[PDB]
């Protein structure tokens, strides 16, 4: 593996490609005879006898097939001999198959049988099938053949609900909702070459390789690349994929079977040429004449003599090799006939087919065809129209045309057999080879396979004419003797790079493994001397290990020299590059990208751009023929882009051919036209590759040039052409002189519809041109500049479409490029892809990005939005910085005083000192400075210091002072993340409740359960919104103003997503402190803020109490390294970080623990394995396992993950959302114990992870958003949190962290990690819900109050320090009022339109009932508004579940469509149906997840944790409608909603039991007890103990769990009375007194195991008669032993009404009492 | 005697040779020199930002002159220094000797708070003397536009010295302004032209600040292939955008449409 040779790959190449003949000799069947005529030699081979079977061969009737597959064989009575010997292997096994048969034997149906077996594996009970589970790939060699298969397979499987499609997705939905993909090998190669987090290949269960003998062709290596990639991916994933090979009957078929992993004794089926549908009499004509023109007419003489032997008796199909020779020969052998009067044999009988052949050749409209069609002859080629071609085959099929001259296209895409087939010549012009070459083997077999109609003819007659020296070849090809060899040595470098880009091959030994799956390898083992391997060598190397490594080594060097790969010869490792990825993803050969990398410069001309394109290696065989130089020189004199090189150079010819194609010039030379087709059909992806190169390098001028050239090649027009001609349906005769009137196109936008008519002098084309002028895509741009610092600028770009959409010209989408250029239009500062979907064609689009700036403020930047498709479709927006107001430079930090470490004794309290003295001896320098101000003062204090600076203890300093000052003092601690609150709770519960016997609580998110803990606890831990709910009622709640100490942690998160809520609560605590006379102490903790003085002044902290430290004074020093990565494709860039992750571990912390943060859960296990194989290739395996062999299995084998066990055995763990909480805890313990050195954590877990490390590696800074289907940057707050984990104070002298990012994001992280963080307010975007709460609580009663309330915010302070950020243009006092008044005016105007508030006399505001409900339950005003529209007087459970689902609270948690069908089939699992449900909405997603939870359906792993988030808000929304329905006086709907409260709590239905809520209760106990008829819960509390194991006896504790539930089952005594039943007037004071009693005391909260949050019992007292559907009085209560309720209503005039008393729960089912009144009106 | 019809003529347009030559203009932007020794000290010191100067060289042509209008201000406390802040490209065509600007001066909101400082133009050959036609062009502009004071406006020449570009700057004299108005002789040496008609001014290239360009709103700036559509009385408005190079496609649409025409 060290002493090796470098080979010459081109000396191993079979030059002749498909024409290579491995067999030295050719044996012909019996009865052949060679005949020497003058000028040419004929060889005849007799037709083979279908020798009559022998052993069992019954033709299998489709009645005997499996029933599910018979629908695919509708119209067929019985399979043929090939299908019947294959049907069990195809339909009843998953065996890989290889079927060789002559063309026409029926191999297509054998592939259809395997397709049906796959379809059968996903047939659901509904009748239709599961489109999700599977996807099928049919690989067909020819594009024309692919299209026919789409129709055939689409029609045969239409009864199954299956969709079949060809390429519709390359141009981009592409592949999904498409279960059968038919494609070429090259297309499936490029699709699977750019493997992202895809939705294609993993669904692939079946691949069909049709015409797999293509392996012998130059295109063969593509099939080797597909199979190797698929088979090698099989063993890596261990998910099986079935491969089916269909081949011609040619040698080496057993090597093909080994290549497809086909068991020869199970899946190999070879049927010689005797199995042809009709026998074939072969005739081969080999011409010896070598002079051109005599051989030309000799050919024209032999064709005629052969035509005459069949004229009148048989149709004859002649194949030639052009769109021009088809009619030229058809006339050349029509006129030769009239010259000899030899057409009485074709026509000439007054036949019944003479006039039809005539009479259809007048509605013919084809000039050449109508010349020939009346006299029997015809032609067919792709240049003709569709109905013209369908004309010629409709006549030929009806046996009306006698002579048909066609090309290969008809043989592939049409099923048109003829009795006699003639191949006139076997030479065709190859522009790729740059010369004439022989026909491919596939074309020959397909054309001669059309000989003999499989129904008429007893025999087929195929005649092939070619040069005499190629006779032995075509005899070998058509008589089962042309061996199939591998042509892969040529394409080896380009294919190896494709596997390096994908990550499948990361070193040389991976490549040797990959090469072992190639068909080249199998052929090398069997016939080594054909492939330049001596049998002397083959045994010095039995499995060709040294040989394959030589090939890989040679190929790797070529890739390395061309800068696609960095090849490390010592280790054999491969490093991917951006140039290498572009070569793979755009299907570019490796020599071409080297040329691009050499010559592409930002200062490049259009002259040099065209020249660089003409030098691509795809054109290496192109030469300038002497017979072409005149027509080429005539063009070189007129081309618009000059060409420096001489016409002698082939690059000048390629250049001119490209310019002529854009200008749509038709040339004369036959080679030039074909050479032009080849250069230009390659220009698309070639120029698209150049574009992506210069775009990702920031070259503004060249990006604009290359993107335009791409569109000029696609549209076939220059910029100067009027862009109206891009509409193909628009007449090409009006544009004519619209161009010639020299006036800009942008003037037509500003004119009417009859002015365009006179400006162009064509009033007849009035509105038509005006219509297309406003169909042309056009976007209007506007920006709101938002300065972050004096060096970083945030930009919000608003994109407004200004054109009417039309699907027939725009399609389903319209793509654009957003480019931000500097002053000189020289550097692309930022760019991103923008897609205008048709469904949003009329909406404004918001785009945000960051941009650097420097401080002699540049004159301007530019924002261009150019189309990806349309020429001359661009809007540039000048971004002037003349009036940009930059924020001031942030003040210097407060210096860190060099004080001596403060001991724990300074607390001077034994119990207090007892909390720390064990953990550490002295406080850190940061805790030392603030100590006196926090512990020995009551002043409000701000402590800003980096993460890991010990800020949690300084907050504890204020808590301990509160305990000294007052015995029952109350502290409220706020932290923005729920994961942080749960860890702070675990720490502080042990320090303050366990050790010093206080009360520490953690807020639930359940209103009433929370409220107690404030009066119960001395330390309340809560998230912002869980305290917003509580403090909103502060004027009615005494447990909110009594707070002695309010501490808010991580206060720098006010600039983040949910920052506005954190801004409101602290602004409220400052206002609450104002109204009472005893200030509430406020302590703010944050990471280092640049504008810390703003937060301090906003929170009322003096200067000496504000501690604004910067990141440089972190206790444990932090070594921060920021690596940039060039690759713009995420999956490839993630690959480029794999080994740097390992190399960063060995360099920065080979000894100490390491945390690796990766973007996704799937990446956690991938990188954990990646680190391990690198450690093993370093032969340092189990270096990260500092524990042992056996002391760890007491921890391993406690998990369900098999890979997590293997990783931990080698010292690497990983954490992600999908692991169970028990597994995460155990991996953390091994990490903190030092047992395992490395753990790979997902980004989602960076806030709730109780482990620290010496080194933290942030692998990439982006993650995929499933909703918007785009990558999103890590919030800077998450990055700060991740870096914080690299801090172990009493373990390491320092902390290290490497941040691997994209190159563009590098300078951003340098500016916001080394410097303190500036924070802003976004409360101005979340104002409604808070304003409404203040209207309800009467803190805001008019518009002046709303402005006063805003002066308490952090938003008010920031909009004078950074006015442009909030769209202020001046810090005037009036500019502040007008800005505040405008915010106030719209916010209140929105609320009153939603009927939440009322506004009187443009000034006074007052709350309505809707606003009071939204404020009470913490619901969005948009949600409660839609509730009132939907709800009505007759709504029960199926409508409540419906409209509660589509609420704003649930909206933005993702919708994944790997489950489009479960939810479609769960809709087929619900009791209440949906009306026209479409399963695209994150709202209907929850609607069925709610129905599933009530049905007790276990769905998936973390789908359940998603419904935990739906359940956490469901109760609050149910109670809201209960308020809405009761306020309107509706009885029936309110009580139904009051029962889904208890339904969603116990997870039951109204149809269901009552005993379903007892613990450990079996499934079928609902009928269980029907035999006894005892279904009450009532019963199961009162039976005798020796059988009160009622019916069933389950264990000694599963009855003791039924006991505890029955003991806390609500057993309530209700006493009700109507006060003064004899003194009621018709509408006076009425009072009803209801009294409740708990036959108990209380044993904690409600027992609801299927509900996450612990609830408490709620109760409704309800009055109203069900006859009228009217509720008259309702109140809520919480019981707790004994309580009375009172309902005051109004008497309804006179009569004798009888009301009904309802007493309902919101948690338990089966306690709803019901008494009816005893009234009497007067 | 001699058999004619022997050889056929093959058209070799000259603009192709210059287009190939114009694509290499970016190399001269690394070696830009300013005439130094002067007589010195006095007048205003005009500071030209490099970014727009390099761009001005890139969009030009080796033999057909191009011109752009100069606008700028003074530093806050230093009135004797003139920082050039913007170059305006207007519809124009030219020869090896002069350029042809319209009568209308640039008029736009962005420029109204700046003062005009003259014009800059390229020329093929470095010369010791200011062009007599430059004196005529500058004086005829002053006569029609009082905002161009003879002591405030200059003529910057960008000479093409092999492998480089040399910048020399001049101002007019009262004698030069008087003779430039009357001059109707375009010839390279008319009667009355004397070296007494101009003086040199000090010019400094800077990297401390950046200038910007203003180009026609519609239109473009290069009309050397559309001289018919250029007229001295033509009107134009401006936009904030960078100009296109000389042989850009939008400046010669006939080369692209006549080639495509069969
Ligand atoms: C829960 N426990 C751990 C679990 C896993 C790994 C580490 C710890 C841990 O204990 O390490 C913390 C802290 O306990 C400790 N610490 C504080 N004062 C100290 C002192 N004077 N000497 C030495 N160590 C001190 O140093 C770390 C700073 O943690 P923190 O206080 O949270 O720093 P922050 O500013 O980021 O607070 P925050 O609001 O972001 S949670
Ligand atoms: Mg086949
Ligand atoms: Mg903190």
């Amino acid at each position: 593996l060290a002493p090796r040779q470098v080979l010459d790959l081109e000396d191993l190449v079979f030059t002749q490609g498909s024409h290579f003949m491995a067999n030295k000799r050719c044996q012909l069947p019996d009865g052949s005879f060679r005949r020497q005529r003058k000028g040419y030699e004929e060889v005849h081979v007799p037709a083979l006898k279908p020798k009559p079977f022998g052993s069992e061969e019954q033709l299998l009737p489709v009645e005997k097939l499996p029933k599910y597959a018979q629908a695919g064989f509708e119209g067929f009575k019985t399979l043929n001999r090939i299908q019947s010997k294959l049907y069990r292997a195809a339909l009843e096994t998953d065996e890989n198959l290889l079927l060789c048969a002559p063309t026409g034997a029926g191999k297509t149906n054998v592939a259809l049988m395997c397709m049906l077996r796959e379809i059968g594996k996903h047939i659901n009970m509904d009748g239709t099938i599961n489109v999700d589970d599977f996807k099928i790939i049919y690989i067909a060699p020819m594009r024309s053949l692919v299209q026919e298969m789409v129709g055939s397979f689409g029609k045969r499987l239409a009864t199954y609900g299956i969709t079949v499609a060809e390429l519709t997705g390359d141009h981009q939905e592409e592949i999904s909702a498409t279960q059968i993909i038919v494609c070429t090998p090259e297309k499936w190669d490029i699709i699977t070459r750019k493997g992202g987090e895809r939705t294609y290949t993993q669904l692939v269960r079946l691949i069909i390789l049709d015409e797999i003998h293509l392996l012998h062709d130059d295109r063969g290596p593509v099939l080797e690349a597909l199979v190797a990639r698929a088979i090698r991916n099989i063993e890596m994933t261990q998910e099986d994929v079935r491969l089916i090979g269909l081949s011609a009957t040619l040698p080496n078929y057993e090597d093909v079977a080994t290549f497809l992993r086909v068991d020869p004794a199970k899946g190999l089926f070879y049927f010689d040429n005797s199995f042809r549908p009709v026998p074939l009499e072969q005739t081969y004509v080999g011409i010896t004449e070598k002079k051109a023109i005599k051989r030309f007419q000799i050919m024209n003489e032999i064709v005629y003599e052969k035509i005459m032997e069949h004229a009148g008796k048989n149709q004859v199909l002649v194949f030639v090799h052009s769109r021009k020779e088809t009619g030229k020969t058809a006339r050349a052998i029509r006129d030769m006939c009239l010259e000899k009067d030899t057409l009485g044999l074709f026509l000439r009988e007054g036949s019944a087919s003479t006039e039809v052949l005539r009479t259809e050749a007048e509605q013919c409209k084809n000039l050449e065809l109508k010349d020939l069609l009346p006299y029997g002859f015809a032609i067919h080629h792709a240049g003709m129209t569709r109905v013209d071609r369908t004309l010629v085959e409709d006549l030929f099929a009806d046996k009306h045309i006698q002579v048909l001259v066609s090309t290969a296209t008809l043989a592939w895409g049409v099923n048109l057999p003829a009795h006699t087939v003639i191949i006139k010549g076997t030479q065709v012009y190859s522009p790729e080879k740059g010369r004439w070459t022989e026909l491919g083997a596939l074309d020959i077999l397909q054309m001669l396979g059309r000989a003999g109609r499989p129904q008429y003819d007893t025999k087929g007659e195929g005649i092939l004419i070619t040069s005499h020296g190629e006779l032995q070849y075509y005899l070998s090809l058509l008589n089962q003797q042309l061996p199939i060899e591998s042509q892969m040595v040529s394409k080896l470098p380009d294919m190896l790079n494709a596997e390096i880009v994908l990550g499948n091959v990361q070193n040389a030994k991976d490549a040797v493994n990959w090469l072992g799956y190639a068909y080249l390898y199998i052929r090398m083992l069997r016939s080594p001397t054909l492939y330049g391997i001596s049998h002397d060598d083959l045994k010095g190397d039995p499995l060709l290990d040294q040989r394959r490594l030589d090939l890989v080594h040679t190929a790797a060097l070529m890739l390395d020299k061309n800068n696609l790969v960095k090849y490390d010869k010592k280790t054999g490792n491969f490093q991917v590059t951006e140039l290498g990825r572009i070569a793979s993803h755009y299907y570019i050969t490796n020599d071409t990208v080297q040329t691009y990398n050499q010559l592409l410069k930002p200062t490049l001309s259009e002259i040099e751009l065209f020249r660089v394109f003409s030098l691509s290696s795809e054109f290496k065989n192109i030469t300038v023929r002497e017979e072409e130089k005149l027509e080429l020189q005539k063009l070189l004199e007129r081309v618009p882009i000059p060409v420096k090189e001489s016409i002698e150079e082939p690059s000048a010819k390629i250049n001119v051919l490209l310019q002529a194609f854009i200008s749509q010039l038709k040339l004369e030379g036959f080679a030039l036209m074909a050479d032009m087709v080849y250069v230009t059909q390659s220009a698309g992806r070639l120029m698209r590759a150049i574009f992506e190169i210069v775009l990702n390098r920031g070259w503004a001028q060249l990006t604009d040039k290359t993107l335009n050239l791409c569109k000029m090649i696609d549209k076939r027009m220059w910029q100067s052409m009027c862009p109206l001609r891009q509409f193909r349906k628009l007449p090409e005769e009006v544009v004519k002189k619209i161009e010639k009137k020299n006036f800009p196109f942008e003037r037509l936008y500003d004119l009417n519809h009859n002015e365009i008519g006179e400006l162009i002098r064509m009033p007849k084309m009035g509105k038509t041109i005006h219509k297309y002028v406003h169909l042309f895509p056009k976007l209007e741009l506007s920006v709101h500049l938002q300065p972050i610092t004096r060096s970083t600028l945030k930009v919000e770009l608003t994109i407004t479409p200004d054109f009417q959409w039309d699907e027939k010209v725009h399609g389903s989408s319209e793509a654009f490029w957003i480019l931000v250029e500097d002053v000189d239009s020289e550097v692309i500062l930022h760019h991103e892809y923008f897609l205008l979907k048709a469904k949003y064609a009329q909406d404004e689009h918001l785009i945000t990005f960051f941009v650097p700036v420097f401080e002699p403020l540049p004159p301007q930047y530019f924002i261009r939005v150019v189309s990806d498709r349309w020429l001359s479709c661009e809007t540039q927006l000048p971004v002037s910085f003349r009036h940009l107001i930059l924020p001031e430079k942030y003040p210097p930090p407060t210096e860190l005083l060099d004080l001596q470490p403060l001991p724990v004794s300074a607390l001077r309290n034994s119990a207090f000192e007892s909390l720390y003295q064990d953990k550490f001896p002295f406080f850190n320098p940061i805790q030392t400075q603030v100590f006196n101000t926090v512990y020995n003062s009551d002043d409000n204090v701000f402590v800003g210091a980096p993460t890991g600076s010990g800020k949690t203890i300084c907050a504890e300093f204020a808590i301990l002072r509160m305990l000294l000052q007052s015995s029952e003092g109350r502290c409220v601690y706020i932290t923005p993340m729920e994961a942080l609150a749960e860890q702070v709770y675990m720490d502080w519960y042990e320090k303050f409740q366990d050790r010093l016997n206080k009360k520490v609580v953690l807020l639930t998110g359940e209103t009433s359960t929370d409220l107690k803990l404030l009066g119960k606890g001395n330390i309340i831990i809560s998230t912002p919104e869980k305290w917003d709910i509580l403090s909103r009622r502060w004027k009615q709640r005494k447990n909110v103003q009594n707070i002695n100490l309010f501490v808010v942690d991580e206060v720098h998160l006010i600039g983040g997503e949910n920052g506005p809520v954190l801004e409101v609560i602290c602004s409220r605590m400052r206002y609450i402190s104002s109204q009472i006379e005893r200030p509430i102490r406020i302590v703010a903790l944050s990471s280092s803020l640049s504008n810390a003085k703003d937060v301090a002044h906003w929170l009322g902290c003096s200067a000496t109490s504000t501690f604004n430290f910067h990141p440089n004074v972190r206790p444990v020093p932090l070594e921060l390294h920021i690596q940039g990565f060039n690759i713009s494709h995420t999956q490839t860039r993630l690959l480029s970080m794999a080994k740097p992750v390992y190399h960063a571990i060995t360099k920065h912390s080979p000894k100490k623990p390491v945390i690796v943060f990766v973007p996704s859960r799937k990446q956690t296990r991938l990188t954990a394995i990646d680190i391990l194989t690198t450690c093993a290739a370093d032969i340092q395996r189990q270096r990260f396992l500092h524990c042992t062999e056996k002391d760890l299995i007491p921890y391993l084998e406690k998990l369900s993950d098999s890979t997590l066990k293997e990783t931990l055995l080698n010292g690497v763990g990983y954490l992600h959302e999908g692991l169970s909480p028990m597994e995460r805890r155990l991996v953390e313990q091994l990490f903190s114990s030092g047992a395992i050195q490395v753990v790979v954590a997902s980004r989602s877990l960076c806030w709730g992870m109780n482990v620290a490390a010496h080194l933290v590696i942030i692998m990439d800074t982006q993650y995929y958003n499933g909703k918007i289907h785009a990558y999103v940057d890590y919030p800077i707050y998450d990055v700060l949190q991740m870096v914080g984990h690299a801090n172990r104070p009493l373990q390491d002298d320092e902390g290290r962290c490497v941040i691997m990012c994209q190159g563009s994001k590098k300078d951003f992280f340098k500016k916001f990690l080394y410097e303190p963080l500036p924070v802003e307010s976004h409360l101005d975007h979340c104002m409604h819900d808070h304003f409404n709460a203040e209207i309800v609580t009467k803190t805001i009663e008019n518009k002046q109050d709303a402005v006063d309330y805003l002066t308490w915010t952090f938003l008010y302070r920031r909009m004078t320090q950074n006015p442009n950020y909030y769209n202020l243009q001046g810090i005037s006092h009036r500019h502040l009022s007008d800005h505040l008044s405008e915010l106030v005016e719209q916010t209140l105007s929105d609320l009153e339109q939603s009927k939440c508030i009322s506004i009187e006399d443009e000034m006074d505001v007052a709350p309505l009932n809707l606003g009071m409900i939204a404020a009470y339950y913490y619901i969005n005003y948009t949600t409660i508004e839609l509730f009132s529209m939907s709800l009505n007087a007759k709504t029960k459970v199926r409508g409540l579940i419906e409209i509660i689902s589509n609420a704003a609270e649930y909206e933005n948690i993702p919708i994944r469509h790997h489950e489009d069908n479960l939810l479609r089939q769960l809709a087929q699992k619900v009791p209440h149906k949906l009306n026209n449900p479409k399963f695209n909405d994150p709202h209907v997603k929850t609607n069925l997840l709610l129905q599933a939870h009530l049905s007790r359906m276990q769905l998936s792993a973390e789908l359940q944790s998603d419904t935990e988030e739906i359940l956490s808000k469901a109760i609050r929304l149910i109670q809201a409608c209960v308020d809405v329905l009761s306020s309107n006086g509706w009885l029936s709907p309110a009580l139904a909603a009051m029962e889904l409260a208890q339904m969603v709590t116990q997870a039951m239905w109204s149809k269901d039991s009552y005993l379903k809520q007892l613990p450990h209760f079996t499934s079928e106990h609902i009928k269980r007890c029907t035999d006894k008829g005892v279904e009450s819960v009532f019963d199961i509390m009162e039976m005798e103990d020796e059988e009160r194991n009622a019916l069933l006896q389950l264990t000694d504790s599963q009855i003791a769990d039924v006991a505890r539930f029955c003991n806390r089952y609500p057993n309530i005594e209700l006493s009700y009375e109507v006060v003064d039943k004899d003194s009621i007037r018709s509408g006076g004071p009425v009072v009803v007194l209801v009294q409740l009693e708990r036959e108990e005391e209380v044993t904690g909260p409600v027992i609801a195991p299927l509900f996450p949050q612990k609830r408490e019992e709620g109760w409704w007292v309800v009055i109203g008669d069900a006859k009228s559907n009217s509720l008259i009085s309702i109140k809520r209560l919480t019981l707790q032993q004994k309580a009375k309720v009172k309902l005051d209503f109004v008497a309804p005039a006179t009569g004798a009404h009888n009301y009904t008393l309802y007493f309902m729960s919101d948690a338990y089912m089966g306690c709803d009492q019901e008494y009816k009144f005893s009234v009497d009106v007067k | 005697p001699l058999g004619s019809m022997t050889q056929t003529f093959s058209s070799k347009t000259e603009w192709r040779v210059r287009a190939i030559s114009a694509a290499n203009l970016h190399l001269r932007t690394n070696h830009i020199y300013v005439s130094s020794d002067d007589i010195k000290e006095t007048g205003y010191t005009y500071i030209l930002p490099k970014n727009v100067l390099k761009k001005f060289i890139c969009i030009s042509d080796l033999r057909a002159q191009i011109a752009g209008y100069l606008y700028g201000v003074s530093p806050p406390d230093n009135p004797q220094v003139k920082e050039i802040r913007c170059i305006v490209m207007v519809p124009q065509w030219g020869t090896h000797q002069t350029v042809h600007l319209p009568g209308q001066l640039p008029q736009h909101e962005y420029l109204k708070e700046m003062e005009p400082l003259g014009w800059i133009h390229t020329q093929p050959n470095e010369s010791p003397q200011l062009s007599p036609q430059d004196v005529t062009t500058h004086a005829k502009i002053m006569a029609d536009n009082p905002s161009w004071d003879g002591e405030k406006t200059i003529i910057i020449t960008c000479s093409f010295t092999p492998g480089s570009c040399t910048l020399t700057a001049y101002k007019l004299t009262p004698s030069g302004y008087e003779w430039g108005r009357q001059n109707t002789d375009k010839g390279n040496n008319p009667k009355g032209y004397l070296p007494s008609h101009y003086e040199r001014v000090q010019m400094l290239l800077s990297d401390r600040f950046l200038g910007f360009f203003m180009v026609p709103a519609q239109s473009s700036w290069n009309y050397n292939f559309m001289g018919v559509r250029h007229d001295p009385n033509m009107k134009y408005e401006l936009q904030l955008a960078n100009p296109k190079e000389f042989y850009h496609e939008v400046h010669r649409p006939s080369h692209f449409l006549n080639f495509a025409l069969l």
Side-chain angles (χ1 to χ4, degrees), chain A residues 1182-1323:
Chain A
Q1182 301 198 141
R1183 174 246 293 267
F1184 305 126
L1185 183 71
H1186 286 285
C1187 176
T1188 184
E1189 60 258 1
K1190 53 187 75 85
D1191 310 71
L1192 182 49
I1193 300 95
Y1195 317 87
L1196 290 150
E1197 281 297 333
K1198 292 73 189 306
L1199 319 98
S1200 36
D1201 202 326
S1202 39
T1203 326
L1204 188 42
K1205 305 182 197 306
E1206 298 292 81
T1207 42
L1208 288 169
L1209 270 158
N1210 307 294
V1212 172
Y1214 58 87
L1215 313 156
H1216 59 74
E1217 321 86 279
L1219 299 182
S1220 72
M1222 182 251 200
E1223 302 170 303
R1224 275 171 56 183
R1225 195 266 158 211
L1226 200 137
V1227 173
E1228 291 174 291
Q1229 221 278 306
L1230 303 172
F1231 186 73
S1232 46
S1233 63
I1236 53 181
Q1237 193 181 333
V1238 182
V1239 60
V1240 186
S1242 191
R1243 65 152 266 99
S1244 325
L1245 291 192
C1246 69
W1247 294 103
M1249 190 161 18
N1250 193 229
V1251 293
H1254 171 239
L1255 168 65
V1256 162
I1257 297 178
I1258 311 187
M1259 213 191 61
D1260 216 27
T1261 56
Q1262 299 184 15
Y1263 73 100
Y1264 194 79
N1265 207 231
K1267 265 163 206 114
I1268 62 183
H1269 292 125
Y1271 282 102
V1272 181
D1273 295 317
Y1274 286 1
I1276 187 61
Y1277 311 109
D1278 288 28
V1279 176
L1280 298 162
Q1281 177 71 9
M1282 286 169 170
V1283 178
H1285 295 272
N1287 161 73
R1288 305 197 307 168
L1290 302 154
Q1291 301 247 31
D1292 309 317
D1293 299 328
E1294 75 284 297
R1296 300 199 178 97
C1297 168
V1298 179
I1299 295 189
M1300 294 164 190
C1301 63
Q1302 217 172 346
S1304 63
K1305 280 86 165 65
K1306 183 178 184 177
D1307 190 49
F1308 178 88
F1309 290 126
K1310 290 185 48 175
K1311 284 192 272 202
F1312 296 99
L1313 296 168
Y1314 295 117
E1315 310 171 27
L1317 194 74
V1319 297
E1320 305 280 357
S1321 171
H1322 302 91
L1323 182 64

